[PDB]
Write a protein that binds this ligand. Structure first.
Ligand SMILES: Nc1ncnc2c1ncn2[C@@H]1O[C@H](COP(=O)(O)OP(=O)(O)O)[C@@H](O)[C@H]1O
Ligand SMILES: [Mg+2]
Lengths: 737, 374
């Protein structure tokens, strides 16, 4: 390569394409594009350095001397066209789904992986999960695998492959094949058709594989932390609610519909945006799902019961509360709907009617009624809907784990696998979007911390003492912005305060948060012209805009203890068993609060263990290989935090080379510095670094290695290609003359 | 876009009338009031909102003390004015003033400081490419679509009088009389008190403003109507307060506007409006008077009262030579005449070169207002 300075350029067919700097001045550099060969001007900050071919198709992206999104994107692209799906970026393990079925995942490969370090072999899942398994037998401490939300990617499918590895390693009746069967169940209940994807997991899935001290499978269970239950009640403009609702509607025949008394989509208030077809023909899917349940060993009776309550949640919509002239309390003049509800549950209509409309509350020790507005009672209806759904989901998970069988229990330790939807961005970005972002924030923070401890311990292993700030702290102010209840209060807290205070509007909310918390650097009010979204924050991924409309309504989840009690008394086994219930429970209780709590549980669980990280990307909408859409990959790199990971490691000394490698490889650089061969290989590096004139800030001396900054090896490599040019010239001239 | 549109704002005291140049009516018209919470609030999760501006203030009147930032065409308090403009652009129009040239109205004979300081704000508060500050009366004359006339301009701020002939304009002849809607209001609340009704506070001062805006009318002969007040039948009208109280106002009704014609009621020597019109016309050249007598245009909010035109006609005709006929042209929609005039002026192509440019201001300073424009 010539010293034209091939430097990656922004462009809007390829996200980053190679181009020769040559002419420069100020921000504007006139640059020769490798492909077209046309010269155009752009600001120079925009344009990111390229790594030499020696780095091309690197196993580990941390190894690149130039760390930027452009270099990342090139490396990944290169790998992918080459047919290589797996790459390691820093701590991350990056996979890009080819959508083809690849010959991979044989027995030879897995055996081949065993007992080796990640660098020792090519990138693969089997490697990182090997890291987890080995760290468990070795460290005797539990491990966790984080997969970040990507479609539809077959993240689960990949995870089946992880389990396949796990089985082959741990020995000594096939694997839990019903794990495959579980997908449609949880998929049906848990997932919905959205703008980003037709199938996307709202709920987080935590899959625990339990291992004895011997290292064998005692069994497994599933845990489901976060759910968006607000999705059932409320939805985006052009999206669908959970699959089960629709597949229930079209799928159930008169045989089942007549029992459940299901109606078409137009009949239900709780179903937004109409039927929203969607089919897909449906109905067939529902049919598949029933068998999927059945093999798992749930009785037809149980299925019918389940589907009945799934109707019940929808039925909560048909109830209409009518505001009464003059009085506050409102009421329900039409018994038909709630009569239907009462058939669908154990409730007496009258009991329920009094309870809902005018509930009784324990003002110790003697009960007293309450007056409830129309709005308040509506929220209660929506609450019981949402809480009902959540309870149902929980029971499914527990009943499912019963359908999973374990050997001798309590022995000894587990490997968690977390499947959760990744950081989301839409154009509009409603409330749920914010909650998702909040969780992805904390997860990201854990990753940073993990990386931090890895690097800090790596320094000691190489004997370099260095102190540097916790990487997790970067996210912390953003997190406090959303979370922090107290001194300055957080967005969630302030939302809750808005919700309870008498005449609360969305506008009063945003104004309030501006006034309360605008001094926060990660918070930005757009102001002036639109800027359709009313306030914005600055995450790791980037700046996201939020629309505040109807946030107060989404936040409200007041729950009547009286009606809840009635459920606890239900005649039917299913629902009564479900409601087999501290906080602020009753009224108060906000979705934001519950969500926060649930996330706290999850963060504790994950925090207990040693995590490991996998990042999934889809190349294209096409569902076919050989096509990598750079823009989409950029977007994914934003929301999975990989960009953040590169901007993290840059702050430290990402490039680590051994003395021996550094000398043998680069010796050509400095014939002067390098002596006659004292050897020991330390002195070599001492000399090399010394005459090459490098700032002591830009390297450290370690036991087996030297730690380097970004771009130091870029300069040294340029001195190797310059040196090689000098030597090519001297050689060729000498041979010629 | 072509021409970029342009923005127009009429701020005589009382009302801001704003909208896009190139339209027949303004989008936003609201009272120029900055109410402040006088009473310390005790809840949590209020506001707090240090103050309220525009018809927001009207809505939440009782709590606030209201301060009109403009008095007698002079801005008393600048930050308040800035707040009002802020409200116009962001709250109603939803424009970035950087994207539009803005026209302001302003009253004649008015202190320099207001024009200069006005411009200073427009450039160094709301960054704006260009602006102009224009005399109220002329604008209304344009709106009326006549080239010649003597424009009687009385807003809530102050009353003004500018004779114009064939375009042109007569500086010596321009007259400015300190009476206004606001002074009538102050008179009116005074005159109610003899009936028992006592309105002591800014809040209810606006209630009487509202009363005047409908109930009051001008007598076609004051003494006759006052005589017929003996037998009270039609001259009394029930009015409903927001409190639910009912007010009943007889002769007190029409003597309120009478003040314009008899400022002795108010206690000022300054002649009545009709006499001021004579004062203007008489200052003008003998030749043109014929058409000024015939082309008197009324503008501004405080000419709205029913029967004013007729009274002015009777008085002017009485005073003047009956050799020439005295037509008075007072359109309905007069209230908005200034703003309409502004719309038409910014719509004019040639005008598009007369703007005070941001650039020009930056080189030459704020003082350039007088240099360039009238
Ligand atoms: N319908 C009406 N009838 C009678 N008087 C009115 C009416 N509307 C407004 N006014 C009087 O005129 C004033 C409004 O004048 P306005 O046109 O806003 O002046 P400017 O254009 O200089 O601000 C009010 O304060 C009130 O006293
Ligand atoms: Mg006016």
């Amino acid at each position: 390569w010539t010293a034209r300075r091939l430097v990656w350029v922004p462009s809007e067919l390829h996200g980053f394409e190679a181009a020769a700097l040559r002419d420069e001045g100020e921000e504007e550099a006139e640059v020769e594009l490798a492909e077209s060969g046309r010269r155009l001007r752009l600001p120079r900050d925009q344009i990111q350095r390229m790594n030499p071919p020696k780095f091309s198709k690197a196993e580990d992206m941390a190894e690149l001397t130039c760390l930027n999104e452009a270099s990342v994107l090139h490396n990944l692209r290169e790998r992918y066209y080459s047919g290589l799906i797996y790459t390691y970026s820093g701590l991350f393990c990056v996979v890009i789904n080819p959508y083809k079925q690849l010959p991979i995942y044989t027995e030879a490969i897995v055996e081949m992986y065993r007992g080796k370090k990640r660098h020792e072999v090519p990138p693969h899942v089997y490697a990182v999960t090997e890291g987890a398994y080995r760290s468990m037998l070795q460290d005797r401490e539990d491990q966790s695998i984080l997969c970040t939300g990507e479609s539809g990617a077959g993240k689960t499918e990949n995870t089946k492959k992880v389990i396949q590895y796990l089985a082959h390693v741990a020995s000594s009746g096939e694997l839990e094949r019903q794990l495959l069967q579980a997908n449609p169940i949880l998929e049906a209940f848990g997932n919905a058709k959205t703008v980003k994807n037709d199938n996307s997991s709202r709920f987080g899935k935590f899959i625990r594989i339990n291992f004895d001290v011997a290292g064998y499978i005692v069994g497994a269970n599933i845990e489901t932390y976060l759910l968006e239950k607000s999705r059932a009640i409320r939805q985006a403009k052009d999206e669908c609610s959970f699959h089960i609702f629709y597949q229930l509607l079209g799928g159930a025949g008169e045989q089942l519909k007549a029992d459940l008394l299901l109606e078409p989509c137009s009949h239900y208030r709780f179903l937004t945006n109409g039927p929203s077809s969607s089919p897909g023909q449906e109905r067939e899917l529902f049919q598949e799902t029933l068998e999927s349940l059945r093999v798992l060993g749930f009785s037809h009776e149980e299925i019918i019961s389940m589907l009945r309550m799934v109707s019940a949640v929808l039925q909560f919509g048909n109830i209409a509360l009518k505001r009464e002239r003059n009085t506050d309390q409102a009421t329900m003049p039409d018994n038909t709907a709630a009569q239907k509800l009462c058939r669908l549950l154990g409730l007496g209509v009258t009991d329920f009617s009094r309870a809902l409309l005018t509930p009784r509350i324990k003002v110790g020790r003697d009960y007293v009624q309450k007056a409830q507005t129309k709005e308040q009672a509506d929220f209660a209806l929506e609450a019981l809907a949402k809480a009902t759904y959540e309870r149902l989901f929980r029971w499914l998970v527990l009943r499912l784990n019963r359908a999973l069988d374990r050997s001798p229990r309590q022995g000894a330790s587990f490997l968690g696998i977390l499947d959760i939807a990744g950081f989301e961005i839409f154009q509009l970005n409603s409330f749920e979007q914010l909650c998702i972002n909040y969780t992805n924030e904390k997860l990201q923070q854990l990753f940073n911390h993990t990386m931090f401890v890895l690097e800090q311990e790596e320094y000691q292993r190489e004997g370099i003492p260095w102190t540097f700030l916790d990487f997790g702290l970067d996210l912390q102010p953003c997190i406090d912005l959303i979370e922090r209840p107290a001194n300055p209060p957080g967005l969630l807290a302030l939302l809750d305060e808005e919700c309870w205070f008498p005449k609360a509007t969305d506008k009063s909310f945003v104004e309030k948060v501006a006034q309360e918390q605008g001094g926060h650097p990660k918070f930005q009010r757009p102001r002036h012209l639109r800027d359709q979204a009313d306030f914005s924050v600055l995450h790791y991924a980037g700046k996201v805009d939020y629309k505040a409309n109807e946030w107060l309504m989404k936040n409200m989840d007041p729950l009547n203890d009286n009606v809840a009690a009635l459920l606890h008394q239900s005649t039917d086994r299913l629902t009564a068993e479900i409601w087999k219930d501290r906080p602020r429970r009753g009224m108060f209780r906000t979705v934001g609060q519950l969500y926060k709590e649930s996330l706290s549980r999850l963060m504790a669980t994950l925090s207990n263990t040693n995590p490991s990280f996998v990042r999934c990307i889809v190349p294209n909408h096409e569902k076919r290989a050989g096509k990598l859409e750079p823009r989409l990959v950029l977007d994914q790199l934003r929301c999975n935090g990989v960009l953040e990971g590169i901007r993290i490691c840059r702050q430290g000394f990402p490039n680590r080379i051994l003395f021996q490698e550094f000398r043998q490889r680069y010796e050509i650089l400095t014939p002067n510095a390098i002596p006659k061969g004292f050897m020991d290989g330390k002195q070599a590096c001492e000399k090399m670094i010394q005459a090459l004139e490098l700032d002591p800030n830009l390297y450290r001396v370690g036991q087996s290695k030297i730690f380097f900054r970004a771009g130091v090896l870029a300069q040294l490599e340029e001195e190797r290609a310059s040196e090689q040019t000098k030597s090519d010239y001297l050689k060729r001239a000498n041979e010629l003359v | 876009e072509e021409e970029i549109a342009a923005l127009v704002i009429d701020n005589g005291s009382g009302m801001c009338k704003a909208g896009f140049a190139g339209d027949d009516a303004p989008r936003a018209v609201f009272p120029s009031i900055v109410g402040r919470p006088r009473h310390q609030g005790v809840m949590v999760g209020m506001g707090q909102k240090d103050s309220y501006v525009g018809d927001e203030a009207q809505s939440k009147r009782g709590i606030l003390t209201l301060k009109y930032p403009i008095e007698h065409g002079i801005v008393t308090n600048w930050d308040d004015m800035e707040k009002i403009w802020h409200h116009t652009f962001y709250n109603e129009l939803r424009v970035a003033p950087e994207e539009h040239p803005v026209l302001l109205t302003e009253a004649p004979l008015n202190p320099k400081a207001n024009r200069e300081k006005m411009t200073q704000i427009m450039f160094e508060t709301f960054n704006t490419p260009a602006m102009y500050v224009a005399i109220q009366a002329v604008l209304s004359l344009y709106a009326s679509g006549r080239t010649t006339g003597i424009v009687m301009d009385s807003g809530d701020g102050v009353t003004h009088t500018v004779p114009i002939y064939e375009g042109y304009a007569l500086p010596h002849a321009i007259l400015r009389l300190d009476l206004a809607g606001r002074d009538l209001t102050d008179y009116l609340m005074k005159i109610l008190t003899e009936r028992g009704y006592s309105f002591t506070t800014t809040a209810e001062r606006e209630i009487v403003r509202d009363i005047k805006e409908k109930l009051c009318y001008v007598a076609l002969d004051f003494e006759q109507e006052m005589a017929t007040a003996a037998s009270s039948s039609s001259l009394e009208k029930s009015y409903e307060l927001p409190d639910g109280q009912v007010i009943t106002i007889g002769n007190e009704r029409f003597r309120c506007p009478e003040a314009l014609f008899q400022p002795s009621f108010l206690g000022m020597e300054s002649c009545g409006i009709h006499e001021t019109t004579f004062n203007s016309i008489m200052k003008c050249d003998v030749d043109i008077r014929k058409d000024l007598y015939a082309n008197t245009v009324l503008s501004g909010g405080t000419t709205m009262y029913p029967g004013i035109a007729d009274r002015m006609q009777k008085e002017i005709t009485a005073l003047a030579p009956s050799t020439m006929k005295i037509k008075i042209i007072a359109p309905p929609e007069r209230k908005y005449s200034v703003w309409i005039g502004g719309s038409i002026l910014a719509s004019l192509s040639t005008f598009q070169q007369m703007w005070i440019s941001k650039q020009e201001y930056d080189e030459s300073g704020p003082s350039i207002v007088h240099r360039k424009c009238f």
